[PDB]
Each structure stands twice: as C-alpha cells, then as structure tokens.
Structure 1
Amino acid sequence: ARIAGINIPDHKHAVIALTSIYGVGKTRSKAILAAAGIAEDVKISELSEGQIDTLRDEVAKFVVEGDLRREISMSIKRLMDLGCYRGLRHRRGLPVRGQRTKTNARTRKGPRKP
C-alpha cells in the first residue's frame, strides 16, 4: 500500500488506514471511501491495484502531506512578517488564541526550567 504522500498505510481497516495521511482526518476519510465506492470496515487485503488508484485520484483533490505542510507554514510566516499580534506570538512561542500565561501555557512554552 502507498497513497499520495509517499506514506505506506498499514493492513488495518480502510477508514483508519486513510487517516495516516496528513490532511485527512475522520470526515475526509469517510467522504473519500463514499465517493470511491469502497466499504469502511474492509482491510488492505483483497483491495487490488484497481481500487487503490481510484482512492489516489479521490485524495488528490485536497492539499495533503508536504503540499499542506508548506501551506500551513506559509500562513504562520505571513502573520509574522505582517507585524500583527498573532504573528508576534508565533515569533515569541506563546499562546496565540488569547489563553492565560500567568500559569498553564506549557504546550506552547515547552517544559519549564528554573
């Protein structure tokens, strides 16, 4: 198995195997199998090359993997060069969405040091 973004999906069920791609979650994976006419509870075994390429053509419609990674990074860098509040916070590695910094901001800040 090999779909769009170089990655090799495991020999698990169709819906969870497609979530391995960066840019396809639960909703996209369900929509991709519904448009290609493949069952959700079927494994990679029995799924021949004729059924793989029809999913590859279906997943090609949305920006996934490296193509999506640079798209997310470009929007972060856009805010940064802009000089806006949102960009100053991506530059200072602190919570962007307005969250408190007095306490609990450890995901963005990273582990504490004395």
Structure 2
Amino acid sequence: ARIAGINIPDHKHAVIALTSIYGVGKTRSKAILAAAGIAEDVKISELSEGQIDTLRDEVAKFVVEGDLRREISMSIKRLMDLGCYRGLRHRRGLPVRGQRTKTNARTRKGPRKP
C-alpha cells in the first residue's frame, strides 16, 4: 500500500511485506502485526483500508527510513571526525571490528585491484 517511505509490494504476506521498510526486519514486523491486531498469513492485498490505516502510525514508534539513514550517517561521521580508531578504519575503508586484512576483507576494501 503506502507506509512511511513507500510500501510497493502487494501480493506478498504482510509479515514479509513490511520488511521492505528500512528499519523493519522480521522480529519487529511480526510484533507490529500482532500489535495492530492483524494476523500474519493474511496478504496485504486483502487488507481493507481499515487495517493499513493503523499500520501507517504503528511504525512511528521505531525510527525508520525517514530518519534512520540520517542517524547512521551521523553516527559514522562522529567517529570519522573524532580521530579514534574506528574513525581511522572508516577513513581508509578497512575493517573496523579488528579482523584479518592480510588476505580477506574483499567486502570492505573493494573488488580485487592490483
């Protein structure tokens, strides 16, 4: 239907349709449906507007697409400009949890370039 950012996917189970929201995964999507009184098996298409209306406000209790990306970028910016270790690792594009960079860490470094 239409939720905070956008809810494109109809024809999918509601419990797994709200997972297209940047901030709702699987355990929260299960919780929100139970809180709003909607079961899990019921498809989003079958949902009359008397249900999705309560879904557009339930997500307001969790930080979501509208603000979540701003906070994460702000969160990373705080460490990057701080000068601490995890800021330095972000600055160079290297692993920040303290793991091997001798051979692995293709995901963080990037594609294999000579």
Decide whether the 8 Å contact of 1:11 with 1:44 is kept in 2.
yes
SS in 2 for 1:60: helix
SS in 1 for 2:61: coil
CA distance in 2, matches of 1:111, 1:45: 41
Structure 1 segments (4+ residues) deviating >3 Å: none
**C-alpha displacement of 1:49:** 1.1
**2-11 or 55-64, which deviates more:** 2-11
Structure 1 residue runs of 5 or longer lacking an equivalent are none
1:79-110 CA distance string (max 9 Å, x none)? 01110000111111000000111010001001
Decide whether the 8 Å contact of 2:6 with 2:21 is kept in 1.
no
With normalisation by structure 2, the TM-score equals 0.95
**C-alpha displacement of 1:8:** 1.8
Decide whether the 8 Å contact of 2:4 with 2:66 is kept in 1.
no
**C-alpha displacement of 1:9:** 2.8
CA distance in 1, matches of 2:95, 2:75: 16
CA distance in 1, matches of 2:102, 2:111: 15
Decide whether the 8 Å contact of 1:2 with 1:9 is kept in 2.
no
CA distance in 2, matches of 1:41, 1:32: 14
**C-alpha displacement of 1:61:** 0.9
CA distance in 2, matches of 1:19, 1:71: 20
**C-alpha displacement of 1:45:** 2.3
With normalisation by structure 1, the TM-score equals 0.95
